[PDB]
Structures are given as structure tokens and as C-alpha cells.
């Protein structure tokens, strides 16, 4: 079967994404046949407080930029009367899928990496200008679109965890994805250690740092022997124990000691010149200590210098 | 983009399911065009030991039954040379999708619930006859198919956590979904409290009990104010602190006390006669005490008695 709103229709088997609060479907405008991605909230999502439910709607109605997936319409699905989000369809899918390809085992080609850099920075700048935090940035929700000239353009999506947050404002609520998650959030959300901490916009810089390391090398920067998901204790030791300036930490052997590095791997796909410029960016955003990590002004200045 | 094996092909946008280790695509046999669901493992999945990776393949090769989604072929995808699983496509989707429908907000119609009962029992019996434990049973991986006579037939799938395990064998590894997870496993996997416990095949009985409660009432049996995922500590209190005989525990108000019940809610969609037969079944499988919990045989005997 299918579901529909006044103007749009989607088959329930035409899935594009699956999540805690919502699924995304490939759907069509009824009259034109034009394709869209339609985000449809599940029952359990309505247990959230109303102001929380409204955030993604308010956030997306505020944004408009080439590095953010476009929102076309908000309409009401008929059987539930719930609002759905009707968004630009990106037929190429995500950066996650690009990174899975064998040719990218040791990182993206430098040309493609520089594009990811440009576009993630551009998206993040647009959010910050508009006082928005994302809180779940990762390759799985950075979408690839083929631009006018045949080259990639990447765009941020999945604003399910996003909110308006003034430049110095803090929050205590938990969102995100374990492999990409700032250590202070990981501490509470994954290890359940409550150390009475607050979090700020800079959580997005940590996830971007992890995303860039991943795009640059083909691997996540912080890796217990079993992978992050399967050894939460060691994952936490890697991310909280890392020396200042380190950008990666790996446990090579089961139950083994941890090795951290402040440089890119020897296998890194990027030119050595770029590696040398990238490494300080990563070191200063993969920095848990709020006293030492970069602010946004600087992150944008320092990456915009690399792009030129 | 598409991926293919010798005999089958799928578009990467044609998704049917997404998970930690794999995605499932709607694909086709290249020559006949016949439709299949194709399970394809992601890169991070290969961090698992090889014997663990092989389990799902070995398990599915053993099974052949009306209440198990059929395995058609194992073939190699070309770009990675990884084996994929080529399965029966069920165009109707899952029991989870059925349960989202507003008409089922207070539980399935009795005629449908009885079908779910017959079929989950039939699938679970087939697994036990073959020495298999599933370890992630929930509505999301119970698929609905329309039988010859127009009536539903449900079938188990997603054997990503499954293994061979005799009644007299135990394990310490962790799998499952928090809302459906046996308390001993929840304690370690979700709360990360380690009490040197070992788990057995009867973990599938707990998930089945939660699944049946959900199908009978339209709601999960164990429910903090914010939902299970948004308040794990209270969830643990609920599932471990319930009296013997209790089949549900609900926190009504934010930070409120917990309402335990050994009976179905007054809103239950099932006839009262069926309710009274169902409740002792749920009471004796939603029981962590292994000295008290039913085994599979007694569970199949008592559910068979309801069906006839
Ligand atoms: O937004 C989310 N996730 C981001 C993706 C879904 N959204 C969109 N998707 C596309 N096109 C597209 C094309 C090919 C493949 C895909 N999907 C995948 O490749 N997957 C999904 C599961 C496994 C790998 C998507 N266009 C626009 C959007 I907006 C959310 C998931 C759950 C809540 S939000
Ligand atoms: O097996 C899994 N999951 C079970 C489902 C995927 N498998 C199959 N699906 C179908 N048909 C089908 C039809 C309509 C919709 C759907 N999907 C959904 O409705 N979704 C998926 C995302 C949210 C809701 C599936 N037939 C056969 C199979 I095998 C796994 C997911 C990740 C690893 S394994």
C-alpha cells in the first residue's frame, strides 16, 4: 500500500531512510509525477514534548542554501493527519555510500575530498549564521547531488535532532550517533556516566572532524578492536584518553593497548601537502576541552584558507 | 547506481531495511525480472570474527518453513566479492507497519492477532527444532504475506543475530532491541552493569511475549513516561522490579510511580475470553526467573491450546 497527502503520494516499500522517530520515502507529486523525499513520523515520536516535535519544522522553514537539502512543502498525511516533510530527492544517495566503495578504502580522491570540505563547511556556516545546531552530522546524512557541471555538490539533511541555539547557549539533552559523538555526550548517552556536564554548538565540530577524518582516510578515527559499537568501554577510553593534538586512536589487538596518532595514516589518499594543512584543523576540532577547541569563526577562517 | 551478482541486480536507492551491519534492497533476477529482497553487508560488519559472520548464512541454509522468509540463493556481489543473501520479497512489509496504523491503536482485530499467534509460534517452533535462537524478534522483522485465501501469513526474518544454540547452551554476547530485550541482557547491554550473567535460548520467549503484548494492545508493555529509549534507568526499574505475574509496567506522569498490571488494559481490542487465556501465557514468558519461566515446549503447548 501507499500513503498520501493532498498533493503527494508514496509507496510504503519505497524507503530511502529509516530512523527512531521517522522514515523517509521516495514519493511523487500527484499531478506532475516529480520525485521528492518524504519524511514521515512514526507513532512513538509523538511521545516527545510538542515544542521538541516542532523544532525540525521550524528549523527547516528557516534554512535555504545550496549545501542544505531543500524543503519543498509541509502537508498532512490522510490516515493520521500528521504533518510530513516534503524534501528534495537526491537520487545519488549519501556520502556514506560513496565511502563504502572499495576504491575509497583509503580515502576519497583529493578532488572529491575538497568538494566535501567546501560543502560541509558551507552548510555548517549557513546553520551557524541562522543560529541552528544539527547534532547528528555524519556521512549517512550528507547527500550527494550532481551539479550543473557534472561535479558533486554535497548537502546536509536529517534535522531530526536540530534546534535553535544562541551562540553561547548550552543544552543537556542527548542526540547523535556513537561513532561521531562528542566525548562529553558519549559519556552520558552511551556509558551512562552522569558527570553533570553541559554541551554546546561545538558538538557539531566534533562530528564534522570525525566525518572529515573518515572521508580523508576511508576509516573512522577512533576504533576499538571490535569497532566502536561493539566496545563502548574502549571507545570511551580512546576518545577521552587521547593526547592533545591526536586525531585518531586505535586498538590493534583484542583486549590490547591503545595507539594514538596526531598525523594522517601513511595510506591516506590525499596529497601530502593537503594532509599537512588538514591535520591541525582536525586536531583543533577533535578537542573535547572547551578551553582549547576552536570556535566557529576560526574553523571557517582556517578551512576557507585551505580551500584557497 | 546499482550492484549485482551473477544472477541478480538491485538499485542502491531501492531500500527495504537499514541496520548496523547490513541493508536490504528490493532487487530482481536479471533474466526473469522476478523480485527478491537482497541483504548486503556493509564494510564495518567485516570487523566481526569470521565464525560470527558465517552464522547467518549457516542458519538460513538449515531453515525451510511457511513462517520463515525463504532463502533463495547466496551469490557474490561483484565490486566487493562479498556474499549476499537473496530472500523472498514480501511486498506487504512488516507487522510493525500494521501496528502503526490508527485502526490498530488499541490492538489488532482478534482474527488477525490469532494469525500472528499461530505464525510466530510456527516460526519459533521451526527454529527450535533446528537448534536456532534468533535474538532480535520484534514486529519490525515479522513479515506479512498474503496467502492463497487472502488471509495474512506472517514470517520471521532478520537472522543477523541468530546462532545455533541448544537448550543446554549459554552465551554472553549481546544482541537485540531495547524495548524487546530480556532484563538480564538489558542490564549489561543497555545499562552496562556487569553481573557475570549468562543468557540462554529463552531470551526469544521474552521478545515474543513483548511482541504479543504489543500486538494485543497496540502498546509496549514496559513504558517509562518518555518511552523506553528516552529513559533507560526507569525502563530497567520497570522490567526488573515487576512482581511475578505482572505483564506490564507503566510510568504515567513525568517522574511518577510505576503502575504494574497482570491483566490486559481495558482498551484491549481482543475479546475478553481470549484476554483471559492470553494473560497467563504472557505472565509465564515475561518471567526472568529461569526456575519459573516456561520453556519453549510448554509455551508451544499452551499457545496451541488457545489456537484449538
Ligand atoms: O534523512 C534521513 N537519512 C538520509 C537519507 C534519506 N533521506 C534522503 N534520501 C535521498 N536519496 C537517497 C538515495 C539513495 C539512497 C538513499 N538512502 C540510502 O542510501 N540508505 C538509507 C538506508 C541505508 C542507506 C537516499 N534523498 C533525499 C533525502 I531528505 C533520515 C533517515 C531517518 C530519519 S531522517
Ligand atoms: O530484514 C531486515 N528488516 C526487515 C525488513 C526488510 N526486509 C524485507 N523486506 C521485505 N519487504 C518490505 C516491504 C515493505 C516495506 C519494508 N520495509 C519497511 O517497512 N521498513 C524498513 C525500514 C522502516 C520500515 C520491507 N521483504 C523481505 C525482506 I527479507 C533487516 C534490516 C537491516 C538488516 S536486516
Q: Domains of chain B: which residue ranges?
A: 1-89, 90-308
Shortest distance, CA B308 to any CA of chain A (angstroms): 32
Contact assignment for B47 to A79 by CB distance below 8 Å: no
CA atoms in the 13 A half-sphere facing the CB of A170: 8
Q: Which ligand is nearest to the CA of A36?
A: 1
Instruction: Provide DSSP, A143-190.
Output: EEEE-TTS-EEEEE---TT-EE--TT--B----S-GGG--HHHHHHHT
Nearest to residue B231, comparing CAs of B201, B191, B173?
B191
| Residue B293 near residue B287, CB atoms below 8 Å | yes
Task: Return the CATH number of B90-308, one of 1.10.10.10, 2.60.40.1760, 1.10.390.10, 1.10.510.10.
Answer: 1.10.510.10
Topology of the domain covering B1-89? Phosphorylase Kinase; domain 1 (3.30.200)
B11 to each of A10, B25, B28, how far by Cα in Å?
Answer: 18, 8, 9
Phi, psi of A143 (to 5 degrees): -90, 145
Tell me how far the alpha carbon of residue B280 is from its chain's centroid: 21
Protein residues whose CB sits closer than 6 Å to any atom of ligand 2 = A 12-13, 15, 18, 23; B 16-19, 22-24, 37, 39, 69, 87, 89-91, 93-94, 97, 141, 143, 157-158, 160
Cβ-based contacts of A191 with chain B (< 8 Å): 192
Give A171: exposed, middle or buried? Use CB within 10 Å, 0-12, 13-18, 19+: middle
Nearest to residue B83, comparing CAs of B41, B47, B49?
B41
- Inter-chain contacts counted by CB atoms under 8 A, chains A and B: 59
Question: What gap in Å lies between CA B67 and CA B76, rounded to an integer?
Answer: 27
Question: What gap in Å lies between CA A264 and CA A278, rounded to an integer?
Answer: 9
Inform me whether the C-beta atom of residue B16 falls under 8 Å from chain A C-beta atoms: yes
Shortest distance, CA A48 to any CA of chain B (angstroms): 7
| Residue A159 near residue A175, CB atoms below 8 Å | no
Contact assignment for B18 to A16 by CB distance below 8 Å: no
Question: What gap in Å lies between CA B59 and CA A305, rounded to an integer?
Answer: 54
Contact assignment for A43 to B191 by CB distance below 8 Å: no
Measured between its terminal Cα atoms, the distance across chain B in Å is 51
| Residue B281 near residue B302, CB atoms below 8 Å | yes
Question: What gap in Å lies between CA A40 and CA A59, rounded to an integer?
Answer: 16
Cα dihedral value B237, B240, B246, B249, nearest 10: 20
Question: What gap in Å lies between CA B170 and CA B167, rounded to an integer?
Answer: 8
Sole residue written with cell 582516510? A217
| Residue A278 near residue A212, CB atoms below 8 Å | yes
Cell numbers representing residue B132 in the block:
536456532
Q: What is the 3-state secondary structure (H, E, C) of chain B?
A: CEEECCCEEEEEEEEEEECCCEEEEEEEECCCCCEEEEEEECHHHHHCCHHHHHHHHHHHHHCCCCCECCEEEEEECCCCCCEEEEEECCCCCEHHHHHHCHHHCCCCCHHHHHHHHHHHHHHHHHHHHCCEECCCCCHHHEEEEECCCCCEEEEECCCCCCEECCCCCCECCCCCCHHHCCHHHHHHHCCCCCCCCCECCCHHHHHHHHHHHHHHHCCCCEECCCCHHHCHHHHHHHHHHCCCCCCEEEECCCCCCEEEECCCCCCCCCCHHHHHHHHHHHHHHCCCCCCCCCCHHHHHHHHHHHHC
Residues 99-138 in B contacting A (C-alpha not used; CB under 8 Å): 100-102
Atom number in ligand 1 closest to CA A97: 19
Contact assignment for A15 to B16 by CB distance below 8 Å: yes
Q: What stretches of A177-225 show up as alpha helix (H) in DSSP?
A: 183-189, 203-217
Is it true that A1-89 and A90-308 share their CATH fold? no
Question: What gap in Å lies between CA B285 and CA B31, rounded to an integer?
Answer: 47
Inform me whether the C-beta atom of residue B192 falls under 8 Å from chain A C-beta atoms: yes
Question: What gap in Å lies between CA B101 and CA A79, rounded to an integer?
Answer: 8
| Residue B140 near residue B161, CB atoms below 8 Å | no
Amino acid at each position: 500500500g501507499s500513503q498520501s497527502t493532498s498533493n503527494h503520494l508514496w509507496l510504503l516499500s519505497d524507503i530511502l531512510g529509516q530512523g527512531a522517530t521517522a522514515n523517509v520515502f521516495r514519493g511523487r507529486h500527484k499531478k506532475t509525477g516529480d520525485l521528492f523525499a518524504i519524511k514521515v513520523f512514526n507513532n512513538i515520536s509523538f511521545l516527545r514534548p510538542v515544542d521538541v516535535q516542532m523544532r525540525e519544522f521550524e528549523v527547516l522553514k528557516k534554512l535555504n542554501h545550496k549545501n542544505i537539502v531543500k524543503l519543498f512543502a509541509i502537508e498532512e498525511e490522510t490516515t493520521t493527519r500528521h504533518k510530513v516533510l516534503i524534501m528534495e530527492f537526491c537520487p545519488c544517495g549519501s556520502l556514506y555510500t560513496v565511502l563504502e566503495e572499495p576504491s575509497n578504502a583509503y580515502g576519497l580522491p583529493e578532488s572529491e575530498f575538497l568538494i566535501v570540505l567546501r560543502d560541509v563547511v558551507g552548510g555548517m556556516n549557513h546553520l551557524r549564521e541562522n543560529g541552528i545546531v544539527h547534532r547528528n552530522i555524519k556521512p549517512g546524512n550528507i547527500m550527494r547531488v550532481i551539479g550543473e557541471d557534472g561535479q558533486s555538490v554535497y548537502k546536509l539533511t536529517d534535522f531530526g535532532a536540530a534546534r535553535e541555539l544562541e551562540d553561547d547557549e548550552q543544552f543537556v539533552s542527548l542526540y547523535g550517533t556513537e561513532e561521531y559523538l562528542h566525548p562529553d555526550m558519549y559519556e552520558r548517552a552511551v556509558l551512562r556516566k552522569d558527570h553533570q556536564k553541559k554541551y554546546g554548538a561545538t558538538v557539531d565540530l566534533w562530528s564534522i572532524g570525525v566525518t572529515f577524518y573518515h572521508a580523508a582516510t576511508g576509516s573512522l578515527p577512533f576504533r576499538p578492536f571490535e569497532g566502536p559499537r561493539r566496545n563502548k568501554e574502549v571507545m570511551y577510553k580512546i576518545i577521552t584518553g587521547k593526547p592533545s593534538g591526536a586525531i585518531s586512536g586505535v586498538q590493534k589487538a583484542e583486549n590490547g593497548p591503545i595507539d594514538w596518532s596526531g598525523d594522517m595514516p601513511v595510506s591516506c589518499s590525499l596529497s601530502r601537502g593537503l594532509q599537512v594543512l588538514l591535520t591541525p584543523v582536525l586536531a583543533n576540532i577533535l578537542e573535547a576541552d572547551q578551553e582549547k577547541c576552536w570556535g566557529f569563526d576560526q574553523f571557517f577562517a582556517e578551512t576557507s584558507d585551505i580551500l584557497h
